[PDB]
Design a protein around this nucleic acid. Structure first.
Length: 48
DNA sequence: GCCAACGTTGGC
DNA sequence: GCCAACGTTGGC
């Protein structure tokens, strides 16, 4: 994508409820493994 | 207070 | 209706 080196993205499928079958993505910072739950939040972190 | 789970919201 | 960013919230 436009992500830097060592950034991992993970799909998690919603298993239950009305939204079941929906996918949420999560972003992992390379050498810290810190977790962000959107693209707006990650590029903000990288921009500041 | 953190956060995983699932809900809500509005531009498309 | 889809998408996905973001609201909420109860169990830890």
């Amino acid at each position: 994508n436009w992500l830097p080196p060592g950034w991992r993205v993970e799909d998690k499928i919603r298993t239950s409820g009305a939204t079941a079958g929906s996918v949420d993505k999560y972003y992992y910072e390379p050498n810290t493994g810190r977790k962000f739950r959107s693209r707006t939040e990650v590029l903000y972190y990288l921009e500041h």
